[PDB]
Design a protein around this nucleic acid. Structure first.
Lengths: 98, 49, 93, 17, 107, 98, 87, 107
DNA sequence: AAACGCGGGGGACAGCGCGTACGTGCGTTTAAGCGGTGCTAGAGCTGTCTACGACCAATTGAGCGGCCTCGGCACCGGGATTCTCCA
DNA sequence: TGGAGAATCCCGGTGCCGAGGCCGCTCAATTGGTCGTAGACAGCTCTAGCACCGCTTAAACGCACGTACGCGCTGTCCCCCGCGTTTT
């Protein structure tokens, strides 16, 4: 990450260096077009973080969840899905805890 | 039940059935002292742990 | 797979000496290490003496010399006597 | 642009620990 | 013939033919004078008694019938000649003797 | 009556109880990661005995404790109860390390 | 921060200043200077390395990949830190 | 049959066959691979080359074309890895190196 | 040399100052460590195998002890130099 | 900042015993054949180190601060050595 970009800022080469990531920018206008919500699973502590960059890069709102957090925010984020008026379509979910 | 789905079972223990009391176990140990010394004698219908 | 150790022997000297005190296997392991430790210390010192005077029969005289040399104070003179003691029990037997 | 060298040969050195 | 162990001849627990076997094994001399293993197993049992003594002492001083390496530390390091002879031997889970520097004590 | 002490006071019971007890005083995952880091630095990829990890730790923290006594010996010898690094380096010097 | 974690310190510094305080209290320090927590750490790692390099040297002469507490016995005895309860 | 030493075979001066005779007669192991005598006598020749350099160096620095033990002191102890290697090894009549303490000397 | 003194002046020492530091308390997390997985790796156990220097026979010149110097360096005479203590 | 003097370094003349080589004369060091055996090395297995995260939570860390002690500064007196002594 440092040898590619030492500035580690929001860059266009975040989603153009990988193969899932270029196609993910192909669907993100279309996911915003289709209006159907998408649940995506990731590995812990690293793949979600760079996905937090990319969904913020195309400016699609998103939630998150993990294992070393507290349980207070767990049930509240369940309640935020049950409201249908969510402007966020995609969000981030875990396999081992979630 | 698992820690991921605790309150949803308890919310369904509220809406789908009344008169069944529920005892939870979560978080820091300070809040448990109020419950598990009050219901130390075990006046409940369900412990949801 | 019966492999000769000193755990029941340190147990033997334990219940010979402190039968009121059982052992942890950690202290047992410390002593089982220590047994072969000084078993190598004094006998390497004894082979050092067996090369000091170029000898090939290390007897209890030579272990007496090693006990004389290495051990401080009573630790010599007791192991002088005790190291002779069962020697006098085995040279009899 | 396109999908796509200096980052590879540096990775050829840096990841060789 | 049978393993009729040579410690019983010496009144010992440490089989003196295992000791004679070890002395023939350890390259100490060509002939192992057969009292050298008895000298060895005899000094061995003397020191086994020496240390099992103070070990049970310190263990029951800590009101435990199980001799632990902490008890081994507090019995061995209290000795002049032992810890003088074993200044460089460390006991895992032996720890420290309880003692503070004098001027660091508050007044 | 509150018990705010001045800089100096609370330490000594620990100086009792540590020496009254028999254990190590270190976070073990930063210690076992230290073992794996340092042992990797000589030759990487070891399978790692944690027995080796504690077998190093026992000789470690004992030697650590052992140096601080001569450190304060140089400190109080130089009429100080606040220890200095020059006490440590002189202590390692007369100990032969420095 | 939340975008990329970057939350590591070290393993020698992963030993905490309260851990150095703990050992300093077991070692007899009343008022630790701030420089002690790192001058301690330096000589700690200095002590650490010399054992394990020769322990790996054993491991290679004994043709292994698992550096053992047996190698810690093999080294610390020879490096003058002979320890009872590990061999 | 033909008495011919291994020192020319390895490019040394020290008798590597005396090393092998002492190696079999040192009982370090039963099979004594004769390359282990050469690995010994090689480091012998290499470190004798390492030390005679320094010894004659300190000698000629003392205007001497014979190594005296004072020159051995100035050879070994001024080397940091020799003194680190020979922290408890001494040269008789090597004497002492000139060094006054700092606040003892005037400033 | 030792050995016995002996001014002698500043070095130890006391001691006072001063100010800050370093713990201390306590607020704030936080990574510690625990479980808990999932697995697999080299450890471990066997499985034969041969080569390897053992060992000893023969030999032989190595190399070093006893036998030949003469010369590197010490000793000393004399002087140049160079550090130190009172102007 | 400077000369007087006491210590040092250096340089010229002497000579010597030790450093080094000389002269046999082995004896040890080698070569020459084993010699099974030691470890050489194939297979097997299984385990035991392996990260990893769920999560806690108390330990570490975050900071207010309070003063203690460590040094800032002094005078001393003392005390130990220097100059002179001789004897031992």
């Amino acid at each position: 990450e440092d040898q590619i970009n030492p500035t580690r800022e929001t860059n266009d080469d975040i989603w153009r260096v990988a193969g899932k990531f270029e196609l993910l920018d192909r669907i993100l206008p279309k996911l915003k077009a289709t209006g159907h919500r998408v649940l995506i699973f990731f590995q812990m502590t690293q793949i979600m973080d760079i996905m937090e960059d990319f969904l913020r890069y195309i400016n699609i709102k998103y939630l998150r969840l993990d294992g070393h957090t507290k349980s207070d925010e767990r049930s509240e984020l369940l309640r935020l899905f049950n409201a249908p008026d969510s402007e966020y379509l995609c969000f981030i979910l875990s396999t081992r805890a979630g | 039940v698992p820690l991921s789905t605790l309150s949803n079972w308890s919310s369904e223990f509220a809406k789908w059935a009344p008169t069944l009391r529920t005892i939870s176990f979560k978080g820091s140990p300070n809040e448990r002292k109020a419950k598990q010394a009050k219901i130390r004698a075990g006046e409940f219908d369900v412990v949801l742990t | 797979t019966r492999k000769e150790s000193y755990a029941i022997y340190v147990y033997k000297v334990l219940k010979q000496v402190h039968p009121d005190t059982g052992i942890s296997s950690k202290a047992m392991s410390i002593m089982n290490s220590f047994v072969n430790d000084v078993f190598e210390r004094i006998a390497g010192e004894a082979s050092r003496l067996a090369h000091y005077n170029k000898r090939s029969t290390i007897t209890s005289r030579e272990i007496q010399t090693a006990v004389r040399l290495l051990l401080p104070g009573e630790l010599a003179k007791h192991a002088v006597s005790e190291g002779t003691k069962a020697v006098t029990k085995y040279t009899s037997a | 642009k396109s999908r796509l060298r200096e980052e590879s040969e540096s990775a050829a050195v840096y990841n060789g620990r | 013939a049978k393993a009729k162990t040579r410690s019983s001849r010496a009144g010992l627990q440490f089989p003196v033919g295992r000791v004679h076997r070890l002395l023939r094994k350890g390259n100490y001399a060509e002939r192992v004078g057969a009292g050298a293993p008895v000298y060895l197993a005899a000094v061995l049992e003397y020191l086994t008694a020496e240390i099992l003594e103070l070990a049970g002492n310190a263990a029951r001083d800590n009101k435990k019938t199980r001799i632990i390496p902490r008890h081994l530390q507090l019995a061995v390091r209290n000795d002049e000649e032992l810890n003088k002879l074993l200044g460089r031997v460390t006991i895992a889970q032996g720890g420290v003797l309880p003692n503070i520097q004098s001027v660091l004590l508050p007044k | 009556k509150p018990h705010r002490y001045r800089p100096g006071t609370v330490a000594l019971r620990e100086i009792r109880r540590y020496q009254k007890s028999t254990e190590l005083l270190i976070r073990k995952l930063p210690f076992q990661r230290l073992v794996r880091e340092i042992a990797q630095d000589f030759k990487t990829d070891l399978r790692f005995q944690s027995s080796a990890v504690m077998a190093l730790q026992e000789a470690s923290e004992a030697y650590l404790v052992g140096l601080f006594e001569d450190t304060n010996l140089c400190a109080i010898h130089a009429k100080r109860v606040t220890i200095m690094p020059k006490d440590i380096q002189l202590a390692r010097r007369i100990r032969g390390e420095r | 921060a939340k975008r990329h974690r970057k939350v590591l310190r070290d393993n020698i510094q992963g030993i905490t200043k309260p851990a150095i305080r703990r050992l300093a209290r077991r070692g007899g320090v009343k008022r630790i200077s701030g420089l002690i927590y790192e001058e301690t750490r330096g000589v700690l790692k200095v002590f650490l390395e010399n054992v394990i390099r020769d322990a790996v040297t054993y491991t290679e002469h004994a043709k292994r990949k698992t550096v053992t507490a047996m190698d810690v016995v093999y080294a610390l005895k020879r490096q003058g830190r002979t320890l009872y309860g590990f061999g």
